[PDB]
Protein backbone atom coordinates (compact mmCIF):
# COMPACT_ATOMS: atom_id res chain seq x y z
CA UNK A 1 0.00 0.00 0.00
CA UNK A 2 3.16 2.10 -0.03
CA UNK A 3 5.43 1.81 -3.07
CA UNK A 4 3.88 -0.46 -5.68
CA UNK A 5 4.83 2.08 -8.35
CA UNK A 6 8.63 2.00 -8.06
CA UNK A 7 8.73 -1.75 -7.52
CA UNK A 8 6.49 -2.54 -10.49
CA UNK A 9 8.42 -0.22 -12.79
CA UNK A 10 11.75 -1.62 -11.63
CA UNK A 11 10.72 -5.21 -12.27
CA UNK A 12 9.11 -4.55 -15.64
CA UNK A 13 12.18 -2.77 -17.07
CA UNK A 14 15.02 -4.74 -15.48
CA UNK A 15 17.29 -7.05 -17.46
CA UNK A 16 15.53 -10.16 -16.29
CA UNK A 17 18.70 -12.19 -16.48
CA UNK A 18 19.71 -11.54 -12.86
CA UNK A 19 16.55 -11.80 -10.75
CA UNK A 20 15.97 -15.06 -8.88
CA UNK A 21 12.91 -14.21 -6.77
CA UNK A 22 10.49 -11.31 -6.34
CA UNK A 23 8.11 -10.84 -3.40
CA UNK A 24 5.65 -7.94 -3.40
CA UNK A 25 4.41 -8.28 0.17
CA UNK A 26 3.11 -5.50 2.39
CA UNK A 27 5.94 -5.89 4.90
CA UNK A 28 8.60 -5.06 2.31
CA UNK A 29 9.31 -5.70 -1.36
CA UNK A 30 12.12 -8.20 -1.97
CA UNK A 31 14.40 -8.69 -4.98
CA UNK A 32 16.23 -11.89 -4.13
CA UNK A 33 19.08 -11.99 -6.65
CA UNK A 34 22.19 -14.01 -7.41
CA UNK A 35 25.44 -13.08 -5.71
CA UNK A 36 27.19 -12.81 -9.08
CA UNK A 37 25.25 -9.81 -10.42
CA UNK A 38 24.62 -7.92 -7.17
CA UNK A 39 26.89 -5.01 -8.04
CA UNK A 40 25.37 -4.87 -11.53
CA UNK A 41 21.83 -4.71 -10.14
CA UNK A 42 22.65 -2.09 -7.53
CA UNK A 43 24.47 0.04 -10.10
CA UNK A 44 21.40 -0.16 -12.32
CA UNK A 45 19.51 1.42 -9.47
CA UNK A 46 20.94 4.68 -8.10
CA UNK A 47 21.39 5.65 -11.73
CA UNK A 48 18.18 5.00 -13.66
CA UNK A 49 16.29 8.27 -13.79
CA UNK A 50 13.08 6.79 -12.36
CA UNK A 51 14.04 4.22 -9.72
CA UNK A 52 17.03 6.08 -8.34
CA UNK A 53 17.67 4.88 -4.80
CA UNK A 54 20.75 6.97 -3.97
CA UNK A 55 20.81 5.94 -0.28
CA UNK A 56 21.67 2.62 1.36
CA UNK A 57 20.09 2.26 4.78
CA UNK A 58 21.34 -1.10 6.06
CA UNK A 59 23.40 -4.17 5.19
CA UNK A 60 22.45 -6.87 7.68
CA UNK A 61 23.34 -10.54 7.88
CA UNK A 62 20.96 -13.34 8.80
CA UNK A 63 22.09 -16.83 9.79
CA UNK A 64 20.17 -20.03 8.97
CA UNK A 65 22.17 -23.03 10.26
CA UNK A 66 20.04 -25.57 8.43
CA UNK A 67 20.39 -24.69 4.73
CA UNK A 68 23.22 -25.41 2.32
CA UNK A 69 23.62 -21.67 1.70
CA UNK A 70 24.13 -20.87 5.35
CA UNK A 71 24.08 -17.06 5.40
CA UNK A 72 21.78 -14.39 3.99
CA UNK A 73 22.96 -10.86 3.23
CA UNK A 74 20.27 -8.17 3.05
CA UNK A 75 20.46 -4.60 1.70
CA UNK A 76 17.68 -2.26 2.84
CA UNK A 77 17.73 0.91 0.76
CA UNK A 78 15.24 3.68 0.04
CA UNK A 79 14.61 6.32 -2.63
CA UNK A 80 14.37 9.76 -1.05
CA UNK A 81 13.10 11.23 -4.33
CA UNK A 82 10.40 8.66 -5.13
CA UNK A 83 9.40 7.96 -1.50
CA UNK A 84 9.95 4.22 -1.65
CA UNK A 85 12.24 1.57 -0.24
CA UNK A 86 13.25 -1.89 -1.42
CA UNK A 87 15.17 -4.76 0.12
CA UNK A 88 17.65 -6.61 -2.11
CA UNK A 89 18.42 -9.92 -0.40
CA UNK A 90 21.23 -12.16 -1.61
CA UNK A 91 22.43 -15.57 -0.50
CA UNK A 92 25.95 -16.33 0.66
CA UNK A 93 27.70 -19.42 1.99
CA UNK A 94 30.88 -19.93 3.94
CA UNK A 95 33.84 -18.61 2.17
CA UNK A 96 32.49 -16.99 -0.99
CA UNK A 97 33.93 -13.59 -1.83
CA UNK A 98 30.93 -11.28 -2.25
CA UNK A 99 31.19 -8.14 -4.35
CA UNK A 100 31.45 -4.73 -2.72
CA UNK A 101 29.33 -1.61 -3.04
CA UNK A 102 31.70 0.87 -1.43
CA UNK A 103 32.29 2.26 -4.91
CA UNK A 104 28.61 3.15 -5.30
CA UNK A 105 27.48 3.93 -1.76
CA UNK A 106 30.48 5.00 0.33
CA UNK A 107 28.26 4.30 3.36
CA UNK A 108 28.96 0.58 3.38
CA UNK A 109 32.52 0.21 4.65
CA UNK A 110 31.35 0.18 8.24
CA UNK A 111 28.33 -2.03 7.58
CA UNK A 112 30.48 -4.43 5.57
CA UNK A 113 33.13 -4.57 8.28
CA UNK A 114 30.35 -5.26 10.77
CA UNK A 115 29.12 -8.16 8.66
CA UNK A 116 32.72 -9.37 8.38
CA UNK A 117 33.29 -10.02 12.07
CA UNK A 118 29.79 -10.53 13.49
CA UNK A 119 29.21 -13.11 10.78
CA UNK A 120 31.98 -14.63 8.67
CA UNK A 121 30.92 -13.64 5.16
CA UNK A 122 33.84 -12.25 3.17
CA UNK A 123 33.98 -9.28 0.78
CA UNK A 124 36.26 -9.35 -2.24
CA UNK A 125 36.96 -5.66 -2.81
CA UNK A 126 38.02 -2.93 -0.39
CA UNK A 127 35.51 -2.88 2.52
CA UNK A 128 36.82 -6.13 4.05
CA UNK A 129 39.25 -4.35 6.32
CA UNK A 130 39.82 -5.62 9.86
CA UNK A 131 37.06 -6.17 12.41
CA UNK A 132 35.14 -3.27 13.94
CA UNK A 133 32.67 -4.19 16.67
CA UNK A 134 34.34 -7.09 18.49
CA UNK A 135 37.34 -5.96 20.48
CA UNK A 136 40.54 -7.55 19.17
CA UNK A 137 41.91 -10.92 18.10
CA UNK A 138 38.74 -12.93 18.48
CA UNK A 139 38.33 -16.66 18.04
CA UNK A 140 35.01 -16.99 16.22
CA UNK A 141 32.41 -14.76 14.59
CA UNK A 142 30.08 -14.00 17.44
CA UNK A 143 26.65 -13.77 15.88
CA UNK A 144 26.08 -17.07 14.12
CA UNK A 145 24.12 -19.76 15.91
CA UNK A 146 27.28 -21.51 17.15
CA UNK A 147 29.23 -18.89 19.10
CA UNK A 148 27.57 -19.39 22.50
CA UNK A 149 26.04 -16.47 24.34
CA UNK A 150 28.84 -16.41 26.92
CA UNK A 151 31.79 -16.78 24.56
CA UNK A 152 34.65 -19.25 24.51
CA UNK A 153 37.36 -17.31 26.33
CA UNK A 154 35.94 -14.30 28.10
CA UNK A 155 37.19 -14.15 31.68
CA UNK A 156 39.35 -11.04 31.77
CA UNK A 157 40.79 -9.91 35.09
CA UNK A 158 43.72 -8.16 36.72
CA UNK A 159 46.78 -10.10 37.89
CA UNK A 160 49.25 -8.60 40.38
CA UNK A 161 51.33 -11.48 39.14
CA UNK A 162 51.92 -9.28 36.13
CA UNK A 163 49.19 -6.77 35.12
CA UNK A 164 45.99 -8.17 33.53
CA UNK A 165 45.06 -11.28 31.55
CA UNK A 166 42.32 -13.06 29.59
CA UNK A 167 41.52 -16.63 30.66
CA UNK A 168 38.83 -19.18 29.74
CA UNK A 169 35.31 -18.83 31.08
CA UNK A 170 34.32 -20.30 34.45
CA UNK A 171 31.29 -18.16 35.17
CA UNK A 172 28.99 -18.72 38.13
CA UNK A 173 25.20 -19.09 38.02
CA UNK A 174 25.18 -20.62 34.55
CA UNK A 175 22.82 -19.25 31.93
CA UNK A 176 19.45 -20.85 32.58
CA UNK A 177 17.41 -21.52 29.44
CA UNK A 178 13.66 -21.79 29.91
CA UNK A 179 11.53 -23.63 27.39
CA UNK A 180 8.06 -22.01 27.38
CA UNK A 181 7.11 -23.73 24.12
CA UNK A 182 3.52 -24.84 23.57
CA UNK A 183 2.33 -27.94 21.74
CA UNK A 184 -1.15 -26.84 20.72
Amino acid sequence: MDNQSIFKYSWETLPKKWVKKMERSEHGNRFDTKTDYLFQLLCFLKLHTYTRVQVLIDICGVDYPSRKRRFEVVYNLLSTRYNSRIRVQTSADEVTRISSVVSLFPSAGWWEREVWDMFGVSSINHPDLRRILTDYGFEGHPLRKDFPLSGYVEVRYDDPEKRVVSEPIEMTQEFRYFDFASPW
Binding site: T134, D135, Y136, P142, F147, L149, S150, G151, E154, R156, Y157, D158, R163, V164, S166, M171, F175
Partner: protein, 158 residues
Amino acid sequence: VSKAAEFVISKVDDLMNWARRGSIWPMTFGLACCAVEMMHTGAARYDLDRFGIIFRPSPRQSDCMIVAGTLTNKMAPALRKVYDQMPEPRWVISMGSCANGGGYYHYSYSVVRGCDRIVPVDIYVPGCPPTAEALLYGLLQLQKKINRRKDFLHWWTK
Protein backbone atom coordinates in the same frame (compact mmCIF):
# COMPACT_ATOMS: atom_id res chain seq x y z
CA VAL B 1 49.22 5.67 76.16
CA SER B 2 49.83 9.23 77.37
CA LYS B 3 46.08 9.88 77.31
CA ALA B 4 46.72 13.53 76.46
CA ALA B 5 48.78 12.50 73.43
CA GLU B 6 46.06 10.06 72.39
CA PHE B 7 43.60 12.95 72.50
CA VAL B 8 45.93 15.08 70.36
CA ILE B 9 46.23 12.15 67.95
CA SER B 10 42.45 11.82 67.79
CA LYS B 11 42.13 15.52 67.00
CA VAL B 12 44.82 15.31 64.31
CA ASP B 13 43.00 12.39 62.71
CA ASP B 14 39.76 14.36 62.89
CA LEU B 15 41.31 17.35 61.12
CA MET B 16 42.97 15.17 58.47
CA ASN B 17 39.79 13.21 57.77
CA TRP B 18 37.70 16.38 57.68
CA ALA B 19 39.98 17.93 55.07
CA ARG B 20 40.17 14.79 52.95
CA ARG B 21 36.39 14.39 53.08
CA GLY B 22 35.53 18.02 52.44
CA SER B 23 37.85 18.58 49.50
CA ILE B 24 37.24 15.31 47.66
CA TRP B 25 37.91 15.41 43.90
CA PRO B 26 36.35 12.67 41.76
CA MET B 27 37.31 11.41 38.31
CA THR B 28 34.52 10.47 35.93
CA PHE B 29 34.50 7.36 33.76
CA GLY B 30 31.37 7.90 31.68
CA LEU B 31 30.82 4.69 29.74
CA ALA B 32 27.03 4.40 29.58
CA CYS B 33 23.76 6.09 30.44
CA CYS B 34 24.66 6.55 34.09
CA ALA B 35 27.06 9.25 32.92
CA VAL B 36 23.95 11.19 31.91
CA GLU B 37 22.47 10.79 35.37
CA MET B 38 25.85 11.59 36.89
CA MET B 39 25.74 14.85 34.94
CA HIS B 40 22.28 15.40 36.42
CA THR B 41 23.94 15.00 39.80
CA GLY B 42 26.57 17.55 38.83
CA ALA B 43 23.75 19.68 37.43
CA ALA B 44 21.97 22.50 39.24
CA ARG B 45 19.39 20.46 41.15
CA TYR B 46 21.38 18.13 43.42
CA ASP B 47 24.50 20.26 43.20
CA LEU B 48 27.82 18.50 43.71
CA ASP B 49 30.20 21.45 43.98
CA ARG B 50 28.29 22.38 47.14
CA PHE B 51 29.95 19.40 48.84
CA GLY B 52 33.37 20.54 47.63
CA ILE B 53 33.52 18.22 44.62
CA ILE B 54 35.16 19.15 41.31
CA PHE B 55 35.26 16.79 38.32
CA ARG B 56 38.98 17.04 37.66
CA PRO B 57 39.69 15.42 34.26
CA SER B 58 43.42 14.69 34.55
CA PRO B 59 43.89 11.49 36.60
CA ARG B 60 47.16 12.70 38.12
CA GLN B 61 45.44 14.90 40.72
CA SER B 62 42.10 13.21 41.45
CA ASP B 63 40.94 11.26 44.49
CA CYS B 64 37.96 9.09 43.51
CA MET B 65 37.14 7.25 40.34
CA ILE B 66 33.44 7.05 39.50
CA VAL B 67 32.98 4.09 37.15
CA ALA B 68 29.58 5.05 35.70
CA GLY B 69 28.39 2.77 32.93
CA THR B 70 29.38 -0.62 31.56
CA LEU B 71 32.85 -2.10 31.23
CA THR B 72 33.95 -3.93 28.10
CA ASN B 73 36.71 -6.43 27.42
CA LYS B 74 38.10 -3.84 25.02
CA MET B 75 37.94 -1.13 27.69
CA ALA B 76 39.32 -2.95 30.75
CA PRO B 77 43.02 -2.25 30.04
CA ALA B 78 42.35 1.47 29.60
CA LEU B 79 40.45 1.62 32.88
CA ARG B 80 43.22 -0.23 34.71
CA LYS B 81 45.90 2.03 33.22
CA VAL B 82 43.91 5.08 34.31
CA TYR B 83 43.45 3.71 37.82
CA ASP B 84 47.16 2.97 38.25
CA GLN B 85 48.09 6.58 37.44
CA MET B 86 46.42 8.06 40.51
CA PRO B 87 48.09 9.16 43.76
CA GLU B 88 48.01 6.98 46.88
CA PRO B 89 44.72 7.78 48.68
CA ARG B 90 42.14 6.40 46.26
CA TRP B 91 38.51 5.36 46.28
CA VAL B 92 36.21 3.85 43.68
CA ILE B 93 32.46 4.33 43.34
CA SER B 94 30.67 1.87 41.07
CA MET B 95 27.66 3.64 39.63
CA GLY B 96 24.99 1.83 37.70
CA SER B 97 24.21 -1.84 37.82
CA CYS B 98 26.72 -3.22 35.31
CA ALA B 99 29.77 -1.37 36.52
CA ASN B 100 29.19 -3.60 39.57
CA GLY B 101 28.21 -7.21 39.08
CA GLY B 102 27.82 -7.37 35.33
CA GLY B 103 24.20 -6.28 35.51
CA TYR B 104 22.16 -6.90 32.38
CA TYR B 105 24.75 -7.68 29.72
CA HIS B 106 26.29 -9.73 32.52
CA TYR B 107 24.94 -12.64 30.55
CA SER B 108 26.86 -11.71 27.41
CA TYR B 109 30.31 -12.01 25.94
CA SER B 110 32.49 -8.92 25.49
CA VAL B 111 31.43 -7.55 28.90
CA VAL B 112 33.37 -7.63 32.16
CA ARG B 113 31.06 -8.93 34.88
CA GLY B 114 31.47 -5.86 37.07
CA CYS B 115 34.37 -3.45 37.45
CA ASP B 116 35.22 -5.16 40.74
CA ARG B 117 37.43 -7.52 38.74
CA ILE B 118 39.70 -4.75 37.45
CA VAL B 119 39.91 -2.17 40.24
CA PRO B 120 39.15 -2.74 43.93
CA VAL B 121 35.78 -1.00 44.12
CA ASP B 122 35.18 0.82 47.40
CA ILE B 123 31.43 1.54 47.45
CA TYR B 124 29.30 0.53 44.61
CA VAL B 125 25.83 2.00 44.34
CA PRO B 126 22.52 0.49 43.26
CA GLY B 127 20.58 1.83 40.31
CA CYS B 128 19.50 1.47 36.70
CA PRO B 129 20.44 4.33 36.48
CA PRO B 130 20.72 5.36 40.12
CA THR B 131 18.55 8.37 40.83
CA ALA B 132 20.76 11.42 41.26
CA GLU B 133 19.67 11.28 44.90
CA ALA B 134 21.06 7.74 45.09
CA LEU B 135 24.42 8.75 43.62
CA LEU B 136 24.73 11.72 45.94
CA TYR B 137 23.86 9.47 48.87
CA GLY B 138 26.57 7.11 47.66
CA LEU B 139 29.13 9.90 47.75
CA LEU B 140 27.94 10.81 51.24
CA GLN B 141 28.45 7.17 52.21
CA LEU B 142 31.99 7.55 50.88
CA GLN B 143 32.33 10.57 53.15
CA LYS B 144 31.12 8.44 56.05
CA LYS B 145 33.73 5.83 55.14
CA ILE B 146 36.64 8.26 54.83
CA ASN B 147 35.44 9.78 58.10
CA ARG B 148 36.40 6.67 60.10
CA ARG B 149 39.95 6.82 58.78
CA LYS B 150 42.12 7.09 61.88
CA ASP B 151 45.49 7.27 60.15
CA PHE B 152 47.94 9.30 62.24
CA LEU B 153 47.18 6.94 65.12
CA HIS B 154 48.17 3.98 62.94
CA TRP B 155 51.52 5.61 62.16
CA TRP B 156 52.03 6.50 65.82
CA THR B 157 51.45 2.85 66.73
CA LYS B 158 53.43 1.40 63.81
